[PDB]
Structure formats: structure tokens, C-alpha cells
Design an enzyme around this catalytic site. Structure first.
Site, mmCIF file in Angstrom:
data_model
loop_
_atom_site.group_PDB
_atom_site.id
_atom_site.type_symbol
_atom_site.label_atom_id
_atom_site.label_comp_id
_atom_site.label_asym_id
_atom_site.label_seq_id
_atom_site.Cartn_x
_atom_site.Cartn_y
_atom_site.Cartn_z
ATOM 1 N N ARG A 119 34.354 -19.340 -7.427
ATOM 2 C CA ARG A 119 34.265 -20.655 -7.513
ATOM 3 C C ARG A 119 34.263 -21.371 -6.066
ATOM 4 O O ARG A 119 34.710 -21.034 -5.157
ATOM 5 C CB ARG A 119 35.507 -21.066 -8.263
ATOM 6 C CG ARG A 119 36.874 -20.474 -7.761
ATOM 7 C CD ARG A 119 38.071 -20.997 -8.307
ATOM 8 N NE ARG A 119 39.145 -20.498 -7.574
ATOM 9 C CZ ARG A 119 40.571 -20.415 -7.957
ATOM 10 N NH1 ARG A 119 40.902 -21.137 -9.276
ATOM 11 N NH2 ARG A 119 41.620 -19.793 -7.226
ATOM 12 N N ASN A 157 40.419 -29.305 -8.704
ATOM 13 C CA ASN A 157 41.407 -28.225 -8.533
ATOM 14 C C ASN A 157 41.358 -27.820 -7.241
ATOM 15 O O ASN A 157 40.279 -27.633 -6.612
ATOM 16 C CB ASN A 157 40.970 -27.131 -9.276
ATOM 17 C CG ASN A 157 42.040 -26.209 -9.519
ATOM 18 O OD1 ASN A 157 42.987 -26.444 -10.349
ATOM 19 N ND2 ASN A 157 42.051 -25.038 -8.960
ATOM 20 N N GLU A 158 42.512 -27.509 -6.589
ATOM 21 C CA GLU A 158 42.825 -27.432 -5.308
ATOM 22 C C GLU A 158 41.512 -27.562 -4.196
ATOM 23 O O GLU A 158 41.118 -26.768 -3.455
ATOM 24 C CB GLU A 158 43.232 -25.777 -5.192
ATOM 25 C CG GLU A 158 44.525 -25.522 -5.903
ATOM 26 C CD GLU A 158 45.045 -24.027 -5.600
ATOM 27 O OE1 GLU A 158 44.045 -23.497 -5.674
ATOM 28 O OE2 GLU A 158 46.212 -23.693 -5.821
ATOM 29 N N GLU A 317 51.604 -25.736 -11.078
ATOM 30 C CA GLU A 317 51.171 -24.035 -11.450
ATOM 31 C C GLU A 317 52.076 -23.191 -10.625
ATOM 32 O O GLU A 317 52.495 -23.901 -9.265
ATOM 33 C CB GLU A 317 49.876 -23.940 -10.775
ATOM 34 C CG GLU A 317 48.892 -24.366 -11.429
ATOM 35 C CD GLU A 317 47.486 -23.889 -10.801
ATOM 36 O OE1 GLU A 317 47.415 -22.843 -10.210
ATOM 37 O OE2 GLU A 317 46.343 -24.623 -10.643
ATOM 38 N N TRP A 325 45.799 -11.832 -6.410
ATOM 39 C CA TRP A 325 45.142 -12.138 -5.174
ATOM 40 C C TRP A 325 45.726 -11.413 -3.974
ATOM 41 O O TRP A 325 45.423 -11.831 -2.871
ATOM 42 C CB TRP A 325 44.733 -13.424 -4.692
ATOM 43 C CG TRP A 325 45.972 -14.503 -5.253
ATOM 44 C CD1 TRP A 325 45.971 -15.235 -6.529
ATOM 45 C CD2 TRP A 325 46.969 -14.704 -4.565
ATOM 46 N NE1 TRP A 325 47.143 -15.918 -6.291
ATOM 47 C CE2 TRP A 325 47.767 -15.842 -5.317
ATOM 48 C CE3 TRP A 325 47.745 -14.376 -3.265
ATOM 49 C CZ2 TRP A 325 49.074 -16.350 -4.782
ATOM 50 C CZ3 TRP A 325 48.806 -14.903 -2.756
ATOM 51 C CH2 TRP A 325 49.666 -15.924 -3.576
ATOM 52 N N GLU A 365 40.461 -13.225 -12.566
ATOM 53 C CA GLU A 365 42.003 -13.451 -12.862
ATOM 54 C C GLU A 365 42.709 -12.809 -14.008
ATOM 55 O O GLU A 365 43.900 -13.010 -14.285
ATOM 56 C CB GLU A 365 42.290 -14.963 -12.727
ATOM 57 C CG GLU A 365 42.232 -15.307 -11.289
ATOM 58 C CD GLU A 365 42.317 -16.845 -11.118
ATOM 59 O OE1 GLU A 365 42.254 -17.692 -11.946
ATOM 60 O OE2 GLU A 365 42.567 -17.130 -9.910
ATOM 61 N N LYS A 366 42.145 -11.646 -14.562
ATOM 62 C CA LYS A 366 42.798 -11.211 -15.861
ATOM 63 C C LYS A 366 43.955 -10.445 -15.565
ATOM 64 O O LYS A 366 44.824 -10.224 -16.159
ATOM 65 C CB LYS A 366 41.804 -10.071 -16.519
ATOM 66 C CG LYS A 366 41.463 -8.778 -15.564
ATOM 67 C CD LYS A 366 40.400 -8.150 -16.508
ATOM 68 C CE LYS A 366 39.782 -7.135 -15.603
ATOM 69 N NZ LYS A 366 38.631 -7.631 -14.798
ATOM 70 N N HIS A 368 46.368 -11.639 -13.402
ATOM 71 C CA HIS A 368 47.279 -12.519 -12.965
ATOM 72 C C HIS A 368 48.222 -12.794 -14.238
ATOM 73 O O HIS A 368 47.649 -13.069 -15.089
ATOM 74 C CB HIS A 368 46.393 -14.030 -12.585
ATOM 75 C CG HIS A 368 47.326 -14.912 -11.962
ATOM 76 N ND1 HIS A 368 48.617 -15.369 -12.611
ATOM 77 C CD2 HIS A 368 47.451 -15.532 -10.877
ATOM 78 C CE1 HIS A 368 49.043 -16.554 -11.979
ATOM 79 N NE2 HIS A 368 48.640 -16.493 -10.910
HETATM 80 O O1 LIG Z 1 47.077 -18.059 -8.653
HETATM 81 C C1 LIG Z 1 45.906 -18.403 -8.950
HETATM 82 C C2 LIG Z 1 45.688 -19.862 -9.318
HETATM 83 O O2 LIG Z 1 45.846 -20.427 -7.861
HETATM 84 C C3 LIG Z 1 45.535 -21.790 -7.864
HETATM 85 O O3 LIG Z 1 46.974 -22.190 -8.319
HETATM 86 C C4 LIG Z 1 44.369 -22.121 -9.014
HETATM 87 O O4 LIG Z 1 44.298 -23.674 -9.059
HETATM 88 C C5 LIG Z 1 44.438 -21.293 -10.220
HETATM 89 O O5 LIG Z 1 42.980 -22.032 -11.070
HETATM 90 C C6 LIG Z 1 44.466 -20.122 -10.262
HETATM 91 O O6 LIG Z 1 43.122 -19.571 -9.192
HETATM 92 O O1 LIG Z 2 46.933 -16.508 -0.399
HETATM 93 C C1 LIG Z 2 47.149 -18.141 -0.160
HETATM 94 C C2 LIG Z 2 46.347 -18.674 -1.459
HETATM 95 O O2 LIG Z 2 46.341 -17.736 -2.389
HETATM 96 C C3 LIG Z 2 45.481 -18.177 -3.294
HETATM 97 O O3 LIG Z 2 44.199 -18.202 -3.149
HETATM 98 C C4 LIG Z 2 46.400 -19.087 -3.932
HETATM 99 O O4 LIG Z 2 45.442 -19.536 -5.400
HETATM 100 C C5 LIG Z 2 46.482 -20.248 -3.326
HETATM 101 O O5 LIG Z 2 47.084 -21.364 -4.065
HETATM 102 C C6 LIG Z 2 47.060 -19.780 -2.224
HETATM 103 O O6 LIG Z 2 48.596 -19.594 -1.979
#
Ligand SMILES: OC[C@H]1O[C@H](O)[C@H](O)[C@@H](O)[C@H]1O
Ligand SMILES: OC[C@H]1O[C@H](O)[C@H](O)[C@@H](O)[C@H]1O
Ligand SMILES: OC[C@H]1O[C@H](O)[C@H](O)[C@@H](O)[C@H]1O
Ligand SMILES: OC[C@H]1O[C@H](O)[C@H](O)[C@@H](O)[C@H]1O
Ligand SMILES: OC[C@H]1O[C@H](O)[C@H](O)[C@@H](O)[C@H]1O
EC number: 3.2.1.23
Lengths: 686, 682
Positions: A119, A157-158, A317, A325, A365-366, A368
């Protein structure tokens, strides 16, 4: 700075702590959405975030839009009393888009294309991507304008989770314009980046290229690399702003946020800078397994409260248990669901949300964890989610919403740009980053019974009784002035090693470190003695004469002012040159006091040294019980006061609490002593 | 081989040991330059090297030349009696040049472009780049010819530090032509590289490609990879020669050098081959933090003295304390400034110079220590620098210049090409490189009170009483014949494991290792027993029955000559098959003696084994290193004595003390603290 504006209740509802998480009905057949609603009601869920990665469902081929599915989801939720935080859906583009326009894909340092398959695979400065993202923002807002169940926008998103750096020609052009904006002339860029060295002088802005691949092990211009991090953050900020303004133009008044990545070790963007551009500040945060779990959860949430300028903020979140991860995705200890969440609440959050509502059964992410695990409602995690939901309802009942975390006596300074500067590969040691030092101090303070505020450098740390500069490697002339004034007017200041080595351009302040404030702290460092164990026979540690041991780094202090007092010195064999070199030094400057800590002592060495350091500043009576963290929220005007008490240890503890217990997990209050088990928490109203 | 020619004094000045560093006036306002002169004068500096990365300043756009700033800097130095080692300034090109000509940039194994942003981002065989460099050289020489203050040329800077390897099509064309020069026919290339294996046969020179990316974990043709290292060294040498020749043609008589990267672990170029192409040999050396610090400084300086064929040589750069470029940049222990530098002088240097004069306040090397630190003149490093400059003054008063480090009784042989060969990734073990073994021997000998000479393999190691072949993996027929004659005629020779496995093209000598000289050493090895810790239950060490322990590698010696004596064998559990396998074997051959060490013993194990080994060949205090220089024509003799330990030490010394740091001499006994040193005239 935008006016604070918080997502408001649904028509026919009272103000409540928000509780929920990401919800992805597009992953599950429509049937399960009824079951979702049932269980959301059972858990005390009142808010979820939807559509975050739904671009390909909403615009499944170019110029064709499919809203009916999401319209029906939102209805279902809203009729059940559940409020919706609607995404722009612009976080990741569909395959038709990137197939039609491969120029959207970001390029790494070597110029290699980053493909779809995961993504966020888009260039932050692509004009094509932007046109697509803004078109989707226009369509979403136009379709959902006036929807009675939508209470906020979740923009993208992020930002920069995966696409912080791009080295494409879009980025090259943007970085050129950014440098021009920042510096005005190429001469000032040449001056900033010290380009007289290694024949890097540039005749004009077209000679500025991004910090592309220069061969493994070679050293990039450090002023340029730092600026590239500033620019990357600004570049993404500017896209966010464009998306935000499009949504806001169509839906005026609907509050907008985007989710940050604030954690002790996270520095992808200047999140203090970004906090000015959201109506309410929201964070994504994930526990570090092991010994640092609780205290870093607390730290991150405190930093969030600093970024929010103590306004209530939003935990967008976090995880009920294991993530997907990490190399080893350790589970959370039992009690973490309630405890961690109530730590985020204690540090000022008025919303608590998880990634994600229901544990995915396919995709990346299944594995998670979620609120509804694969195991289903018959699970400890789900019962724990229901328990927390009830707890938040009860805190809502007692009027927690809008109280603010009290001002601490101690500000621990954090600075994103200093962290960036410490990432340079040809610093004194690659083992020192800024970010670890403030966490260590926060923790050592907690070991002494003191809850500190984690305060961004551009914010009002200089309004506190006590402040810490922990490895604040950059100090501009301006921040330097703020430091002298703070102390001269009666401030109490801790300063460490790796503080104030350079100005904001990474130009070294000359004459002895720390070159811009050495007269305030009353020390002079001529050189450094880094330490470690990658070289047989090289120094790996230095004992201090107060019973602590330094690692990784020590300043070679070679004089102290007439006004200073050495509180500790190194013990070392003669041949090293470090024996009896000052390690910890107090000073007096104007009406205030300083303590300079010339080495890394870690959480345990700082905790041990803190009583004597505090005593040199005239503060022996800050002594307190470090087995617990005590966090207070209040509305002083309303005369409301809440206390959150957390066991920080692996044994039960019993401590004196005032007031009435309004919530408890793995803990119990029998007048008026709280017996708190490990991973346990009590909340009191005074 | 070029006639030695040493940079000469300024008009009116006398012969003195040179003292100084890299000087970068371009980085500082011209008012600071006044401050530089005063401090240099105080520190006793008499030479600096300028312009090394100044291309963008001297040619700030294409075809425009700006010399005045540099004319002023040089005049100012020279008027204060400070000589100038002037650079070509061709070390790294300006952005305008790379922007207009991206084809100048080198490419890595994957074909990825290495961009500007650091330095030396150019293809060694780019014709475009060469035109540009030679133009600058021409212009600098025309402009500086006759300047009364320039005493030498510093040509470019550390060729191959970043751009040793290029895999562009320029490299491809050049490597094809190099192969044709070396092997004449494609059949010979096929033969050298053994291309019958893995369908690698080439029909013509156009089918030779550089060792480009072949996927991670895969194995390149080793003969080709080795030839690529020889080729890459030669290619940079050809450019160096071209630049040198331009400069010399304009300023005949001005001595020329370029700075090497000679150190124990350093093997970017065949520096013994390059030493024939300079008027005087110059080195850049940075200390290894921790236990190896002093010994390895000494070792490297000795190798430099070997490369120079004992002519005086030039320490162009070293550091006062921390560098910038390590993962953890440990500082130098107090005393190092004087001590390290006097070690270089002891091992033959008639010039001592640091990178750099004033510590940079911006850019990638600002954390690299200098002569004038960030802290300024009020600093221990600057006081140390000033003392050193006084000490070199005193040494110059006493006639040091021109004396040569004496010929040791022992030559420790070093071979750039054998190091290259040991870097192959499908050797018996990737833990063994050639370079560590000669350093272990030099240190083990010092532990027994002997200062060895580190002698390059093409040099006169076979004129010495005793020599060591330490993991000399390659032995040609010619070198093998030298070994045989050396010993047969009375030489005494140590030979180790990983010696003589192959010829110069890495074809194995068959019939039992070492296959070209097993008759000389009197052993036969049928297989190897490598060791290490990465496989649970596999062998990680072998005790020897002389109370040392082997690690990493052992020879399976299955026979020894009638003329031989086993001095030590392994002890091990029966099932390993190593029990009682010979470990150290002595031999008689002609009038000479050998000892074969079939395993890695480290400095520790070798040091302990040395009396027995030496004893078998029919043959002091290791707490100090004693190093001597001498000139018979002047009837002078100088001794430098360095404490090698972390404890003060007192030892007998002869002669008059002429310099000392963290040491004093009373009634012919020298008390030398850690990191201390004394110099005596006898
Ligand atoms: O920990 C996984 C999580 O990481 C972030 O917080 C993303 O915004 C989420 O969509 C998800 O991918
Ligand atoms: O590993 C650091 C990084 O890891 C994932 O990608 C999380 O989704 C993020 O929010 C961040 O905390
Ligand atoms: O400071 C003394 C120093 O100064 C002179 O310039 C000499 O060249 C040096 O050999 C030494 O005498
Ligand atoms: O790491 C090896 C290499 O390190 C740096 O590049 C120094 O420039 C060299 O002289 C050499 O020591
Ligand atoms: O140690 C740093 C130093 O490395 C080499 O010696 C170079 O030639 C110098 O320009 C400098 O980069």
C-alpha cells in the site's frame, strides 16, 4: 494553528468518550454486518472509522463510483447509535489507476520503482496522484454531505508510513522549489550545506538533486540530508492540506484529522508541525513488547498531549494484543486491553480506538490482533474489549470529557529535527539517537515518583519549573536564547551529552561544546569518548563515583565554571585519560540552576542519580513512590479532578489513594488503599 | 621505477622533517587565514597540502578559471615560511560537470548510477572525465609553474577510495582491452579463467563482460574476479600516470606523489605496483581503536617502508584523535598524537601530516578530528600538536632526515594479489583473508623482542636472514622457485596454512598442498579442517600439545618428510580425526631451515610457539618495540622505543635522549608510561 474542534455526538445523544476502531465491512459479506452491530453494542462501541482503504470499492473503474454498499453500512451503524469517522479513501490507489499511470509510483534511492502489491505506493509530490486524490475527496464529500451519522473526516492514512521518501523527478523538482522557498538564493543553500567541502558548490537551484544513491558506505552531505527530511515532511503536509481543504470546502464544520505515528522511536514526519493543521490530533500507537511496554505507552501518549497543547486528543489506533509486523509478534500481557487504553485516556485522550474491529481472515494483516479475534466473541480479548467499553461509559458518566492532563513540574523536551540530525551516519557514534534519551528521563523520573510532560521543543517547556534537554543535538540561536532566559529567570534545567552541538543547519558551534550555552551550564567539552564493544580493547563503559555506569558515550569535560559543583566523576584506568573527568555537573546561572549530564546513564543510572541532581537544584522534596505512575486530569474551573494509578512492576502493590474509585482493572480499593495487581489500574474521582 | 625525489626546502630554508596537514582555506573567511598562519607557526608546521577538492572553486563553471583566492593563500603561507604541496584538484568534479556529462558517473554491479552528493563519483576509464581532469592539470601547472612556494604535486586524492570498481560500458571496453594485453588470445583467457566449467567459454574478446550482478549468493568466476581487481588497479594507475605526465611536462623537476591507503586490512590497489610510479611514496593511515592501535600503526608504517624500498616516505594523512567514518568513532588515548607520529618517523617517514589542519564546521567530515579542533587553540590536541612540531624540530636538528630504517633479520611477506584471491566467496572458509596473518606474525615477533620488516612479495624478502610467508595463497612458478632457492641456499623460512594453494591465475597446484613447495617445507596436506562457531557441534577449536589453541583453520597433514621434525600436534576427540595430526612441522632443505604452521594460532599462540620454532631453525623484551634508523655516511644511529603495554615499563637504553613523551630517561634506564616513547641518538 487551527481551532480545536472535536467530533460531536449524533443527533439525540450526549457527549461520551468515543470508543471503537477501524471497520472494514468491504471485507466481509453483508450478512456479517448484522453480527458486527450486535457485538459493537455489547462492547460499548459508539464510533468506528470506515472506508480508509476503500478507493477500489468506491471507484472500481476509472470515473465510475459505487457508494450504495457504504451508504448501507453507515445506515446500519447510525441506526444502532454508532457514529462514523469517514475516510477520504485516498490512502492507497486502485490497480486500474497505477496501471493507467505508472508515473504515480515512488522511486527509491537507486531510482527503482516501488510497485503495487502492498500500500501507499505513490509519490507525495506527484501532480497526477494529487488530481486523483482531490477528485475522490470531492466525490466523497459531495456524496456524504449532510449524512446524519458522519461526525468526522479521517483524511488518507498515515502519510509517510511507506512513502516518506521519493527520489523521482517529481520529488527533485519539488525539493528545488522547497530550497528556494527556504533559502531564497543558491548562495545561502551553499552556505547552509557547507558545500565548499568536496567540490559540491552549486551555481543555481537546478544543480540541487535529492540525496540519491551514492554507493554503500559513502557519506551524504549532512545539511542536505537533514533538509531532505524537513522537505519530505512538508511535501506530505502540503498534500494533506490540499485534501483537507477540498473536503472542508464541501462539508464546512465537519472536523478533520489525519492519523499520526507518534511513539518514542518514531520520527517519519515533524508531528509537532503537523499538529497545527488538524482540528483534533490523532495517533496510531503500538506497544513495545517486554519491559518498556507500559512506560512507553504512557510516554507516547504524553507526547501526544504535548503536540495537542493539552487539548483532548484521539487514540485512532492501537492493538488489543499482538501485531503482524514485528519479527516476533509477542502477545500483550493479560490486562493490557483495559490498562493501555486507560493510560492513553489518562494522558488526555477522549477517544479510544483499535486497529481493527474484526480480525481479518485474508490479506497481509490477518495476523494482527483485533477487537473481535478469529476465535470470535467467546475470547478473553473480546470480554476485555467489553469490559473497557463499560469502563469508558462509566468515565463518561462521571464527566471526564474535556478535562485536561495537569501540567507537570517537569517538561521533557522532544525535537523531531534533532532526532533527524542524530540519524546522520558520520556522527561521533551511530549508537546515539536523540529519541532514547527523553524516554530514559521520563522513566527515571517515574522511578522517582514524578510524572513528567513530554513537551515538543517549539512548545512551552520554558514555562515549567523544571525542564530537560535530552540529547537535543540542534540548538538554533533562538532556542539557545530561550535556554539562557529560562535559567536566568529561575528555571531549573537538566542538559545532557549530544545537546547543542550544532545550529539548525548542522553548523557546529565552536569554542568548546556545547558551543552556544556552555556559559549557562558551566562546562566545556573539548572532545568526545564514544564507547562500545565492536573493537577489542576499546572502552566499553565508564564507572562513575556515585555508583552508576556510563555506556555508549561520554563527554571529555576539561573545565567547569567557578559557580559549578561536580556531583560525579568517572573512574577509569589512567591510560584512558578519563579518570576523574567530570561526569555530572551542577551550576548556578542568574536565578536558576542547571545540571549537566555528560554521558548516557540509562533509565537505571538516571533514576539513581536523580535525588542528588535534584538536591543540587534545591529540590530534595520531589521524592515519591515509583512503583506506580500517577496521572491526573482536571477541569480546574468545574473543580473536577481525576486520578489514574498504574502498577509499573511485576508484583502486586498497595498504595494510598484519595477519592472514590470509579474504575478498576486487576485492582481493588478498600478504604482508602488500592491493591493493584501487575498490569493493573484504578481510576479515582476526588 | 621512478628516481626517488623528495620535496625540497623553500629558498633559503634548511633540510627539515616536514610537518603539517591538509589545509582548506576555501571553507573559512580569509580573515581566519591570518589566524591559521599564527597557529601553524606556533605549532611548528612547515608544509601543508592545498586545493585537493578545489575543482569547483578553481573552475566554478565550464571554462571559467578562478585562481586569485589560491594565489593569495599560497603567498601568505610561503611568506610565513610554510611550503605548499599543491594538488591537481582533480579528486572530485563540480556539479556543473556531472550535470552536463552524466556519463562520467560510475555504475555499480547492478548497473545503478552512483550520483554526486559525496565524492569521487567518476568512472576510472571514462574518456570524458579524463579530458576534463587533464585540462585542469594543464591549467593548474601552467598557472603555478615557477611558484616559489610550491614544493610538490599531490595528484588527485586516494584513487579508488570510492570508485575502485565500475561496471559501466567504459569499464567493459577497458577490461576487454586489458585482457587482450594480458593474455593475447581468447584461448588464453578461457584457459586462465577455466571457462570449460559452467558453459563459460568465450569465442572472442567481445564475450568478456565485467563481473556484473549475478544474483545474491551466487558465485562469480574466481579467475575473472581476481583479474578484475588487477584490472581495476591498473586502470586507475593509467589515469594517475596520465595526470602525472601532464603536470610533469609543464613543471619538470617538481616532485609528484599521490596518496595511498596502506594499512593492514587495506587492499584497494596493488600499492607495491603503484610505488614505482611516484617520486616519493605517500600514505594515509588511521589508527584502529583498541588493542591493535599501536602495533598496527607500526605495522602499516613498516609496509610503507617496504613499498618505498627503504627510501624515506611521506605520511600524508593520519588523525589526531577520532575519525568520522566508523560506526563508533572512539577517541585516541592521550599521548597518541606524539606517539603514533613518532612511530611513523621511526619506520622511515621524513614527513608527518594530518587530515586536517582546522576541524571543519560543516559537511560530512566535521566530526573528524583535526590539528585545530572545534574547541580551538585552548585544547589538549592543539598543545599535543605543538609539542609534536617541537619534537620534529629537535629531531631535524639532530640529522634524522635521510636516515633509513635498518634492515631487520626478519621479513614478513605481504602480497596484495594473494589478499584479492582470499576474498573469493567460495574458498574453504570465508573467515580467512591473507592480511590478518602477516599482522599476527609482526605482533608475535614483537612479543619476542624482534622488529620485523613487512616486505612486499615482489621485493627482496629473499635477501633476509629469516622470512615469513603468511597465508600467501598465490605462488607462481617464479615465486615458488624463489622460495626453493632462498631456503636451499641457507635461508630460514616460516610458511603457514593457506600458502601456495594456487598459481597466479588461481589454478590449484595438484598432488597435495602446498603443491609447488611441499618438497621445501617437508609436509603434505590432503584436505583442510576449517573451524568456527556457526554450526552447532562442528569443530570450533583444536588444542595443540604445546599449550596453544588453533582457531578457524587447520591443515590435515597426512605425511612429513624424513628430514622433518613435528614440533606440535593437535589433541582432539578420536571421531574428529584430527587427533595427533601434526600442527607445526620443522624441516631441513639444502642448507636452510623451514617451519610450517598448519593452523591459525593468532598473535597469542604464535608468540608462545616462537622460541621452539626459532630454536629448530638453529636460533628479547616484547614489552617495548625498538625501531632504528641510521645513515653510515653521517655516522648516525637513532633508536625509538615504544611501550606496547598498559603499564609503565623501565628498560635499558643506550645513547642520548633527544625526545620523549610520557617517558623519561635516567642513568641509561628509560621509564616509559603507557602510550609513551623515547628517541635516542647513539
Ligand atoms: O499495526 C497495523 C496498522 O498500522 C497503522 O496504524 C495503520 O494505519 C493501520 O491501517 C494498520 O496497518
Ligand atoms: O515499525 C514502526 C511502524 O511499524 C508499522 O509499520 C506500524 O504500522 C507503524 O504505525 C509504525 O509503528
Ligand atoms: O617550531 C620549530 C619548527 O619550525 C620550523 O619552521 C622548522 O621547519 C621546523 O623544522 C621546526 O624547527
Ligand atoms: O575504511 C577504509 C578507509 O576508510 C576511510 O575511507 C579512509 O578514507 C581511508 O584512508 C581508509 O582507511
Ligand atoms: O579520514 C578522512 C580522510 O580520509 C582520507 O585520508 C582522505 O584522503 C581525506 O580527504 C579524508 O577524507
Amino acid at each position: 494553528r487551527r481551532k480545536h474542534s472535536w467530533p460531536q455526538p449524533l443527533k439525540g445523544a450526549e457527549s461520551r468518550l468515543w470508543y471503537g476502531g477501524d471497520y472494514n465491512p468491504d471485507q466481509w459479506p453483508e450478512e456479517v454486518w448484522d453480527d458486527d452491530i450486535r457485538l459493537m453494542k455489547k462492547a460499548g462501541v459508539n464510533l468506528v472509522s470506515v472506508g480508509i482503504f476503500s478507493w477500489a470499492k468506491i471507484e472500481p473503474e476509472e470515473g465510475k463510483y459505487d457508494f450504495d454498499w457504504l451508504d448501507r453500512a453507515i445506515d446500519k451503524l447510525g441506526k444502532a447509535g454508532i457514529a462514523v469517522d469517514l475516510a477520504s479513501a485516498t490512502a492507497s490507489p486502485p490497480m486500474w489507476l497505477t496501471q493507467a499511470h505508472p508515473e504515480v509510483l515512488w522511486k527509491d534511492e537507486r531510482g527503482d520503482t516501488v510497485w503495487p502489491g502492498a500500500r501507499e505506493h505513490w509519490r507525495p509530490t506527484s501532480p497526477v496522484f494529487r488530481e486523483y486524490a482531490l477528485n475522490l475527496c470531492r466525490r466523497m464529500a459531495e456524496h456524504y454531505k449532510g449524512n446524519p451519522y458522519v461526525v468526522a473526516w479521517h483524511v488518507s492514512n498515515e502519510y509517510g508510513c511507506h512513502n516518506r521518501f521519493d527520489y523521482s523527478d517529481d520529488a527533485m523538482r519539488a525539493f528545488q522549489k522547497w530550497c528556494k522557498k527556504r533559502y531564497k538564493t543558491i548562495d545561502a543553500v551553499n552556505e547552509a550545506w557547507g558545500t565548499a567541502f568536496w567540490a559540491q558548490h552549486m551555481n543555481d537551484f537546478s544543480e540541487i538533486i535529492p540525496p540519491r544513491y551514492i554507493g554503500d558506505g559513502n557519506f551524504m552531505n549532512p545539511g542536505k540530508l537533514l533538509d531532505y527530511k524537513r522537505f519530505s515532511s512538508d511535501a506530505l503536509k502540503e498534500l494533506y492540506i490540499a485534501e483537507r481543504d477540498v473536503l472542508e470546502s464541501i462539508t464546512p464544520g465537519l472536523p478533520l484529522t489525519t492519523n499520526f505515528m507518534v511513539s518514542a522511536g518514531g520520527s517519519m514526519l515533524d508531528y509537532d508541525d503537523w499538529g497545527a493543521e488538524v482540528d483534533f490530533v490523532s495517533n496510531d500507537h503500538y506497544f513495545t513488547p517486554g519491559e518498556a511496554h507500559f512506560d512507553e505507552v504512557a510516554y507516547a501518549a504524553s507526547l501526544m498531549d504535548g503536540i495537542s497543547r493539552k487539548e483532548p486528543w484521539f487514540q485512532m489506533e492501537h492493538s488489543t494484543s499482538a501485531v503482524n509486523w514485528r519479527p516476533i509478534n509477542y502477545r500483550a500481557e493479560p490486562g493490557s486491553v483495559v490498562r493501555d487504553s486507560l493510560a492513553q485516556v489518562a494522558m488526555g485522550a477522549d477517544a479510544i480506538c483499535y486497529f481493527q474491529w474484526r480480525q481479518s481472515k485474508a490479506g497481509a494483516e490477518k495476523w494482527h490482533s483485533s477487537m473481535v479475534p478469529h476465535a470470535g466473541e467467546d475470547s478473553q480479548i473480546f470480554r476485555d474489549v467489553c469490559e473497557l467499553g463499560a469502563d469508558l461509559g462509566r468515565l463518561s458518566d462521571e464527566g471526564l470529557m474535556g478535562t485536561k492532563t495537569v501540567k507537570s513540574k517537569v517538561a521533557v523536551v522532544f525535537d523531531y529535527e534533532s532526532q533527524w540530525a542524530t540519524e546522520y551516519t558520520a556522527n561521533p557514534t551511530q549508537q546515539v539517537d536523540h529519541w532514547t534519551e527523553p524516554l530514559d528521563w521520563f522513566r527515571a523520573l517515574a522511578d522517582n515518583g514524578i510524572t513528567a510532560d513530554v513537551v515538543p521543543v517549539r512548545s512551552d517547556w520554558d514555562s515549567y519549573e523544571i525542564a530537560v534537554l535530552p540529547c537535543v543535538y540542534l540548538l538554533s540561536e533562538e532556542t539557545s536564547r530561550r535556554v539562557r532566559e529560562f535559567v536566568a529567570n529561575g528555571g531549573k534545567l537538566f542538559v545532557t551529552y549530544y545537546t547543542g552541538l550544532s545550529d539548525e543547519n548542522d553548523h557546529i558551534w565552536l569554542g568548546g561544546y556545547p558551543g552556544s550555552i556552555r556559559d549557562v551550564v558551566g562546562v566545556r567539552v573539548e572532545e568526545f569518548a564514544p564507547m562500545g564493544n565492536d573493537m577489542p580493547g576499546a572502552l566499553d563503559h565508564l564507572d562513575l563515583d556515585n555508583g552508576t555506569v556510563a555506556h555508549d558515550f561520554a563527554d571529555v569535560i576539561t573545565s567547569t565554571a567557578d559557580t559549578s559543583t561536580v556531583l560525579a566523576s568517572y573512574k577509569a584506568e589512567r591510560w584512558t585519560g578519563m579518570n576523574e573527568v567530570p561526569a555530572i555537573v551542577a551550576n548556578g546561572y542568574g536565578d536558576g540552576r542547571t545540571v549537566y549530564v555528560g554521558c548516557r546513564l540509562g533509565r537505571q543510572g538516571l533514576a539513581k542519580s536523580l535525588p542528588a541532581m535534584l538536591g543540587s537544584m534545591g529540590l530534595s522534596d520531589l521524592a515519591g513512590d515509583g512503583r506506580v505512575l500517577r496521572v491526573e486530569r482536571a477541569d480546574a474551573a468545574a473543580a473536577s479532578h481525576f486520578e489514574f494509578v498504574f502498577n509499573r512492576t511485576h508484583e502486586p502493590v498497595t498504595v494510598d489513594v484519595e477519592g472514590e474509585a470509579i474504575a478498576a482493572s486487576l485492582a481493588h480499593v478498600d478504604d482508602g488503599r488500592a491493591t493493584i495487581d501487575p498490569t493493573g489500574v484504578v481510576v479515582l474521582r476526588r
